[PDB]
Motif scaffolding. Sequence first.
Motif, PDB file in Angstrom:
ATOM      1  N   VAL A 197      11.384  39.067  55.471  1.00  0.00           N
ATOM      2  CA  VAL A 197      12.785  39.374  55.713  1.00  0.00           C
ATOM      3  C   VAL A 197      13.617  38.188  55.227  1.00  0.00           C
ATOM      4  O   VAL A 197      13.295  37.055  55.538  1.00  0.00           O
ATOM      5  CB  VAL A 197      13.066  39.657  57.215  1.00  0.00           C
ATOM      6  N   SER A 198      14.680  38.446  54.466  1.00  0.00           N
ATOM      7  CA  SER A 198      15.561  37.383  54.013  1.00  0.00           C
ATOM      8  C   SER A 198      17.035  37.815  53.925  1.00  0.00           C
ATOM      9  O   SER A 198      17.319  38.988  53.885  1.00  0.00           O
ATOM     10  CB  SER A 198      15.036  36.808  52.702  1.00  0.00           C
ATOM     11  N   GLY A 199      17.959  36.854  53.916  1.00  0.00           N
ATOM     12  CA  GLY A 199      19.380  37.105  53.770  1.00  0.00           C
ATOM     13  C   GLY A 199      19.843  36.560  52.429  1.00  0.00           C
ATOM     14  O   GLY A 199      19.358  35.532  51.964  1.00  0.00           O
ATOM     15  N   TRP A 200      20.790  37.248  51.805  1.00  0.00           N
ATOM     16  CA  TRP A 200      21.193  36.964  50.415  1.00  0.00           C
ATOM     17  C   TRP A 200      22.673  37.195  50.232  1.00  0.00           C
ATOM     18  O   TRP A 200      23.194  38.223  50.667  1.00  0.00           O
ATOM     19  CB  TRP A 200      20.469  37.885  49.454  1.00  0.00           C
ATOM     20  N   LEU A 201      23.340  36.232  49.602  1.00  0.00           N
ATOM     21  CA  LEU A 201      24.728  36.346  49.225  1.00  0.00           C
ATOM     22  C   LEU A 201      24.632  36.607  47.726  1.00  0.00           C
ATOM     23  O   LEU A 201      24.564  35.694  46.915  1.00  0.00           O
ATOM     24  CB  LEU A 201      25.491  35.054  49.577  1.00  0.00           C
ATOM     25  N   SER A 202      24.620  37.883  47.380  1.00  0.00           N
ATOM     26  CA  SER A 202      24.369  38.335  46.032  1.00  0.00           C
ATOM     27  C   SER A 202      23.040  37.714  45.558  1.00  0.00           C
ATOM     28  O   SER A 202      22.018  37.964  46.159  1.00  0.00           O
ATOM     29  CB  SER A 202      25.562  38.012  45.113  1.00  0.00           C
ATOM     30  N   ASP A 203      23.078  36.911  44.498  1.00  0.00           N
ATOM     31  CA  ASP A 203      21.889  36.305  43.907  1.00  0.00           C
ATOM     32  C   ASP A 203      21.343  35.111  44.717  1.00  0.00           C
ATOM     33  O   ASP A 203      20.208  34.746  44.556  1.00  0.00           O
ATOM     34  CB  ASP A 203      22.218  35.882  42.463  1.00  0.00           C
ATOM     35  N   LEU A 204      22.164  34.537  45.585  1.00  0.00           N
ATOM     36  CA  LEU A 204      21.859  33.308  46.312  1.00  0.00           C
ATOM     37  C   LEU A 204      21.199  33.527  47.692  1.00  0.00           C
ATOM     38  O   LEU A 204      21.780  34.140  48.540  1.00  0.00           O
ATOM     39  CB  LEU A 204      23.184  32.555  46.526  1.00  0.00           C
ATOM     40  N   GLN A 205      19.988  33.025  47.910  1.00  0.00           N
ATOM     41  CA  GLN A 205      19.344  33.195  49.207  1.00  0.00           C
ATOM     42  C   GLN A 205      20.016  32.254  50.197  1.00  0.00           C
ATOM     43  O   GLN A 205      20.223  31.091  49.890  1.00  0.00           O
ATOM     44  CB  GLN A 205      17.834  32.932  49.125  1.00  0.00           C
ATOM     45  N   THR A 206      20.369  32.760  51.370  1.00  0.00           N
ATOM     46  CA  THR A 206      20.987  31.950  52.417  1.00  0.00           C
ATOM     47  C   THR A 206      20.200  31.877  53.716  1.00  0.00           C
ATOM     48  O   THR A 206      20.514  31.032  54.577  1.00  0.00           O
ATOM     49  CB  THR A 206      22.404  32.485  52.744  1.00  0.00           C
ATOM     50  N   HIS A 207      19.209  32.761  53.864  1.00  0.00           N
ATOM     51  CA  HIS A 207      18.402  32.871  55.088  1.00  0.00           C
ATOM     52  C   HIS A 207      16.975  33.383  54.848  1.00  0.00           C
ATOM     53  O   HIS A 207      16.761  34.156  53.918  1.00  0.00           O
ATOM     54  CB  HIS A 207      18.994  33.909  56.025  1.00  0.00           C
ATOM     55  N   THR A 208      16.021  32.939  55.689  1.00  0.00           N
ATOM     56  CA  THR A 208      14.706  33.578  55.823  1.00  0.00           C
ATOM     57  C   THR A 208      14.345  33.786  57.288  1.00  0.00           C
ATOM     58  O   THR A 208      14.790  33.057  58.162  1.00  0.00           O
ATOM     59  CB  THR A 208      13.592  32.772  55.201  1.00  0.00           C
ATOM     60  N   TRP A 209      13.514  34.794  57.529  1.00  0.00           N
ATOM     61  CA  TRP A 209      12.967  35.057  58.841  1.00  0.00           C
ATOM     62  C   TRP A 209      11.623  34.388  58.866  1.00  0.00           C
ATOM     63  O   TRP A 209      10.784  34.604  57.967  1.00  0.00           O
ATOM     64  CB  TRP A 209      12.806  36.556  59.072  1.00  0.00           C
ATOM     65  N   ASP A 210      11.419  33.574  59.898  1.00  0.00           N
ATOM     66  CA  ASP A 210      10.167  32.843  60.116  1.00  0.00           C
ATOM     67  C   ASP A 210       9.445  33.473  61.301  1.00  0.00           C
ATOM     68  O   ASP A 210       9.774  33.193  62.451  1.00  0.00           O
ATOM     69  CB  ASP A 210      10.464  31.367  60.384  1.00  0.00           C
ATOM     70  N   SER A 211       8.467  34.331  60.994  1.00  0.00           N
ATOM     71  CA  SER A 211       7.711  35.094  61.986  1.00  0.00           C
ATOM     72  C   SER A 211       6.801  34.220  62.819  1.00  0.00           C
ATOM     73  O   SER A 211       6.509  34.551  63.970  1.00  0.00           O
ATOM     74  CB  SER A 211       6.844  36.164  61.296  1.00  0.00           C
ATOM     75  N   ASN A 212       6.337  33.113  62.246  1.00  0.00           N
ATOM     76  CA  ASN A 212       5.496  32.191  62.985  1.00  0.00           C
ATOM     77  C   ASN A 212       6.257  31.644  64.182  1.00  0.00           C
ATOM     78  O   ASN A 212       5.784  31.738  65.313  1.00  0.00           O
ATOM     79  CB  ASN A 212       5.023  31.043  62.085  1.00  0.00           C
ATOM     80  N   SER A 213       7.435  31.081  63.927  1.00  0.00           N
ATOM     81  CA  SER A 213       8.251  30.513  64.990  1.00  0.00           C
ATOM     82  C   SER A 213       9.201  31.546  65.607  1.00  0.00           C
ATOM     83  O   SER A 213       9.865  31.254  66.600  1.00  0.00           O
ATOM     84  CB  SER A 213       9.053  29.311  64.467  1.00  0.00           C
TER      85      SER A 213
END
Lengths: 274, 99
Positions: free
Chosen positions: A22-38
């Motif tokens: 799972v990740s968040g994106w401002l168009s082409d630019l990644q701004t977030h990731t989901w870290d399932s471990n933590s």
Amino acid sequence: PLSFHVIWIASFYNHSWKQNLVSGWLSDLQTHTWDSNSSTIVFLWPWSRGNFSNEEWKELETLFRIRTIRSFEGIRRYAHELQFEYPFEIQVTGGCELHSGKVSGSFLQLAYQGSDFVSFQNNSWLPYPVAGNMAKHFCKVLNQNQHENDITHNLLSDTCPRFILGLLDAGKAHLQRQVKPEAWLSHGPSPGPGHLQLVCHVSGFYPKPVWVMWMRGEQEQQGTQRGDILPSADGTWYLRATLEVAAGEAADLSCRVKHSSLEGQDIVLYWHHH
Amino acid sequence: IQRTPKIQVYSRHPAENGKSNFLNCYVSGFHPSDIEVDLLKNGERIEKVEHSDLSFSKDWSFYLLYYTEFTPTEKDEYACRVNHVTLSQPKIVKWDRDM
Ligand SMILES: CCCCCCCCCCCCC/C=C/[C@@H](O)[C@H](CO[C@@H]1O[C@H](CO)[C@H](O)[C@H](OS(=O)(=O)O)[C@H]1O)NC(=O)CCCCCCCCCCCCCCCCC
Ligand SMILES: *[C@@H]1O[C@H](CO)[C@@H](O[C@@H]2O[C@H](CO)[C@@H](O)[C@H](O)[C@H]2NC(C)=O)[C@H](O)[C@H]1NC(C)=O
Ligand SMILES: *[C@@H]1O[C@H](CO)[C@@H](O[C@@H]2O[C@H](CO)[C@@H](O)[C@H](O)[C@H]2NC(C)=O)[C@H](O)[C@H]1NC(C)=O
Ligand SMILES: *[C@H]1O[C@H](CO[C@@H]2O[C@@H](C)[C@@H](O)[C@@H](O)[C@@H]2O)[C@@H](O)[C@H](O)[C@H]1NC(C)=O
């Protein structure tokens, strides 16, 4: 066309093998990731937090904590009746858009095997007509929980609008920056006997809008072919613009680059045949 | 559906023998996501190669950027090797500063 979206990529390869990103994106630019471990949201930039409090982020972390696992598990269990065959892949993108500084729309769509499958619109899931009966069955199952569809709707039409405006404001120095390109000339693959391909490389520009043309003085060379705008790791862009010519007409050719960052001083490079 | 990958190799800066640069391999338009991508130096896998997080375009097809620092030389050959289920053999696209 400024948008923010969260993507889900769920791959189901075997009986007991699978991956969920799972990740968040401002168009082409990644701004977030989901870290399932933590079990947390990772902010990739200091401004990725937008104007949301620590408390709203915790709540959103809980929502993603519960929804990611229930969706992953849910699809694996419904796969048999839905006729999802191993290996298969599910993709989701959800978010909102901006037209002229105003949120224009929100969306939420899901794909099975690379093709449109279902979408969420007007507070319910709707099947994509060509996806057939399995898509209607999938929506029958998804529309069985109004409570959960109301949460989804609140996030698309209240949380997301608020968030993107806050994100573009907080990230303003990064996103409004100007980085000047450099350019160079080389040969390209020869089109055939007695002809050349000339290539102008334009590298390291930001933002994305750029203008590049092969020229004979003030005359634009209409045979100029632009490649795809390609990314670099540092966040800048790269583009090649080619031109095919008879060997004897390569003299007096030049490449002109216009970009927002150059403050009116175009890059001009001359093709040297001497 | 299945979509075969497009592969494009390029340097960040103009090639200059003996000076440090970045070599890039942009692999796009593929489905499914499972893919094997290697940068090669003289046919042989380069070890510390970075890549972007997996993402996809509006048409659902996937894309990745792979990159590493490298120093162009007269003798050294660089390339991108891609395997995917849509390909019958692994595809290799060479870096060429004059093509
Ligand atoms: C890294 C990201 C940080 C970004 C922060 C910015 C926030 C701005 C808002 C962005 C909105 C993003 C789009 C939201 C889409 C939501 O519809 C959607 C929720 O769908 C889920 O559907 C399930 C049933 O089909 C369940 O109802 C589940 O609820 S539960 O109680 O069983 O856990 C439900 O959550 N997503 C979110 O809320 C965000 C988390 C997304 C995680 C990936 C799942 C995406 C949904 C796929 C479809 C569901 C498959 C379900 C299989 C059947 C199960 C019965
Ligand atoms: C979206 O859903 C709403 C809510 O069901 C629809 O609006 C209703 O439509 C009926 C019949 O046209 C009206 O009698 C109601 O007065 C409407 N409700 C409200 C709250 O105004 C709407 O038609 C749907 N829109 C689309 C295009 O899918
Ligand atoms: C983050 O910024 C958003 C965007 O400004 C804020 O939402 C707006 O707040 C004004 C007045 O404070 C309202 O009249 C607008 O209707 C809001 N616009 C939208 C798109 O909802 C929001 O209050 C800020 N903080 C948070 C927690 O979201
Ligand atoms: C299921 O697949 C497992 C993982 O396989 C490897 O990685 C995936 C992503 C594919 O790229 C695949 O070609 C690779 O071999 C295997 O380790 C495992 O043996 C498989 N098990 C079953 C049930 O067949």
